[PDB]
């Protein structure tokens, strides 16, 4: 898929709850001194936008591919499809923003984990979590893709259950 996604016959119809857009600005709270890196991504394997990515050093360049929490390099916050370039916030930096999830029913304050597809899921799935992820809001569906506001702050000392 894509982020921008088209001519319309008519325009689409308060200030509240207007941020529920797939192409919304990922950082709920931004900050200067946040490190952002550029990498290449596979244009036919998996679309890394708003997903946890890992570094795959290929024979021609270092790419980023959707990955699990065990081998996560960071979070892909934006993509330039013209150059097929992914922008990554390293895991060493804090993040507070909207990410792609696969569970349409997640409550606030729950512990979360990133799966092999770079997707937010409940931490009770069984895999030992290695990152501190907490749900700051209930998951919402855009009609279909599920998004959720999360706070990610570093790695977890001892893997939980």
């Amino acid at each position: 898929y894509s982020k921008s996604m088209i001519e319309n016959k008519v325009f689409s119809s308060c200030f509240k709850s207007k941020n529920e857009r797939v192409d919304a600005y990922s950082f709920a709270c931004s900050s200067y001194t946040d490190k952002i890196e550029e990498y290449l991504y596979d244009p036919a394997n998996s679309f890394p936008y708003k997903r946890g990515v890992k570094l795959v050093p290929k024979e021609n360049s270092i790419y980023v591919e959707v990955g699990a929490d065990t081998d996560m390099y960071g979070i892909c916050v934006d993509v330039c499809e013209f150059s097929c370039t992914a922008y990554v916030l390293p895991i060493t930096n804090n993040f507070e923003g909207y990410l792609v999830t696969r569970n349409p029913s997640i409550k606030i304050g729950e512990i979360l984990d990133i799966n092999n597809n770079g997707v937010i899921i409940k931490a009770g799935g069984g895999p030992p979590t290695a990152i501190n992820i907490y749900a700051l809001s209930d998951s919402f569906t855009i009609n279909s893709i599920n998004l959720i506001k999360v706070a990610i702050f570093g790695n977890r000392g001892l893997e939980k259950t």
């Binding site: 709270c29 900050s31 001194t33 946040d34 930096n93 804090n94």
Partner: peptide
Amino acid sequence: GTRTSKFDKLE
């Protein structure tokens, strides 16, 4: 802090 850097993140 005793030593602080300009690139320290504060919330």
